[PDB]
Amino acid sequence: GAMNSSNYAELFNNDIKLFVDDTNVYRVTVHKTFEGNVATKAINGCIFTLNPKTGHLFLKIIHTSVWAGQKRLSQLAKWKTAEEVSALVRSLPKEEQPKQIIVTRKAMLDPLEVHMLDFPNIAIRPTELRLPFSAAMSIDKLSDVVMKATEPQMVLFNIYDDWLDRISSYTAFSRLTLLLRALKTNEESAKMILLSDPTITIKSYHLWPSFTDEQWITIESQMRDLILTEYGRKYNV
Amino acid sequence: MNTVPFTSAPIEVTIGIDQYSFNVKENQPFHGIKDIPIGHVHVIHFQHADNSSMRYGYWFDCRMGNFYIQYDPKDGLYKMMEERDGAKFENIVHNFKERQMMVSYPKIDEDDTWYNLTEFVQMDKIRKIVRKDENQFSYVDSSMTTVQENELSDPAHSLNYTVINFKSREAIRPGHEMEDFLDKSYYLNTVMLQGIFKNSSNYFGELQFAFLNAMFFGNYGSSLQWHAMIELICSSATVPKHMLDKLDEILYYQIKTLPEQYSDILLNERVWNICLYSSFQKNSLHNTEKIMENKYPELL
Numbered sequence A: 001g002a003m004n005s006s007n008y009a010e011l012f013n014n015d016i017k018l019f020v021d022d023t024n025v026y027r028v029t030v031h032k033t034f035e036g037n038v039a040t041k042a043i044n045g046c047i048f049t050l051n052p053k054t055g056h057l058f059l060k061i062i063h064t065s066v067w068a069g070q071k072r073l074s075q076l077a078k079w080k081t082a083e084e085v086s087a088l089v090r091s092l093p094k095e096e097q098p099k100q101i102i103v104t105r106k107a108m109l110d111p112l113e114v115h116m117l118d119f120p121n122i123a124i125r126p127t128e129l130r131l132p133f134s135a136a137m138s139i140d141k142l143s144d145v146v147m148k149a150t151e152p153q154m155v156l157f158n159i160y161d162d163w164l165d166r167i168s169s170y171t172a173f174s175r176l177t178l179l180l181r182a183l184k185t186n187e188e189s190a191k192m193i194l195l196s197d198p199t200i201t202i203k204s205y206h207l208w209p210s211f212t213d214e215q216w217i218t219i220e221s222q223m224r225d226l227i228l229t230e231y232g233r234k235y236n237v
Numbered sequence B: 001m002n003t004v005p006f007t008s009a010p011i012e013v014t015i016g017i018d019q020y021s022f023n024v025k026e027n028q029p030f031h032g033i034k035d036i037p038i039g040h041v042h043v044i045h046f047q048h049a050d051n052s053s054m055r056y057g058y059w060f061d062c063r064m065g066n067f068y069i070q071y072d073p074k075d076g077l078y079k080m081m082e083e084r085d086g087a088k089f090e091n092i093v094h095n096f097k098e099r100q101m102m103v104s105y106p107k108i109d110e111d112d113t114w115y116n117l118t119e120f121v122q123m124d125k126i127r128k129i130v131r132k133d134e135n136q137f138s139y140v141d142s143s144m145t146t147v148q149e150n151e152l153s154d155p156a157h158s159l160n161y162t163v164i165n166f167k168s169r170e171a172i173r174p175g176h177e178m179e180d181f182l183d184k185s186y187y188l189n190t191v192m193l194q195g196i197f198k199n200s201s202n203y204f205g206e207l208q209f210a211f212l213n214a215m216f217f218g219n220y221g222s223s224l225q226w227h228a229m230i231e232l233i234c235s236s237a238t239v240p241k242h243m244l245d246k247l248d249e250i251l252y253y254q255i256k257t258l259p260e261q262y263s264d265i266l267l268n269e270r271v272w273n274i275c276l277y278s279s280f281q282k283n284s285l286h287n288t289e290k291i292m293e294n295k296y297p298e299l300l
């Protein structure tokens, strides 16, 4: 069934699984037309498909050309997500194929199940968690590749950089969600926190700065303060 | 007009014949049913006074043989049987009618209800859903499971309805995943009508037999089958005008006949609200939508 706080360590066992997040697949800017009406202009998007155990991220860039002359884009986007995920699964060797696919929004279940009918043994699942994967376009290097793409493109990353050399996949996952939650609640504050110190750089092959263990604790504390704070600013507490 | 005589009635029971029913008291001098209209299938069904658990009954067609009912005190039920001795049968029936211990099938002459509920139902197809080929009538009861229910346990005592599954490779062409799942026309017209049923009359006839099994014996599997066949049509953008018009008649009479008190369990809220108010065919079932809104506005 669904994924919640009670079966949380399941993410980090040795059954291959992926999260799929479709929030950034279909993206628009809304603007006024010359006649004073409103129109949308689509911008590139991405499927965020993540192995929470390894940190491997299969970033499928969604080029705006895939919407040309299509109707009901918010619906097509879910079916385009499913199709790209199903294509990805098929491209992988059998022993690399996921045993489960967890969707961050329940509207993906049916598009994905239908596309994966060939894989009856892959469980398609929802989750009760409020995961901040939408903030993934707040990671500069990820937003850059999306916005620069001129054609469909798959780009592979490790979203944990070299973290697993020192910490477990549970801790690495918890660090990522804390980072992404903070970016979602106050991006400027979040980014200012991550980069205020010029001496800590982001390596060319990495997404996040090269913090020491001690530095990550400070950073992690500051993101928690930021998230509690904005919750007061928002709710007045 | 034909006759299903009864050897006797040793146990108190409510007897149904098509949409009609009547009480028989323990060892009352009851010897069967007369004036049954030829040309239709029929169902004769039973609910014991002592144990309302298990409605059960027989589908039959008097053109196909001489059938009678006899209680079996070992197996505890009223059993349909065939008499091959036509002479002996006429002999027995004439005596019981001369002594007037038979109820008369009570057909009002303005009433086309049974016809409209069984228009497409054919005994030959019933016998393919209910497999028991040594008899020309077919037994059904409340607890019989369908071939798909056992897929999701005794295959001999199953209802072999045509499996319909919207999230199956049969229903979904590679490369039209979105298209075929949101508009089931391919699955309706090519897979089911042309492929499996051959024509719309066979489809409708299974549709009607599912509904009757569902209402007369509280057979969940039948209810599921009836709703799926409706939903497949309603969810197909491309349906022959003549199937839509007939569907609206079929469902109308089904809705009309349903016991008002059984509506909450025999009508699936999601399917009807979708079919009547969201589907491609939401505008196409005028009679069916008018009776559903005037009789069961709660469900919607």
Ligand SMILES: N#C[C@H](c1ccc(Br)cc1)N1CCNCC1
Pocket (backbone or CB within 6 Å): B214, B215, B218, B219, B220, B223, B265, B266
């Ligand atoms: N009470 C009732 C309903 C029901 C019964 C018969 C028919 Br036909 C349709 C629905 N179901 C309860 C739970 N599973 C068993 C049946």
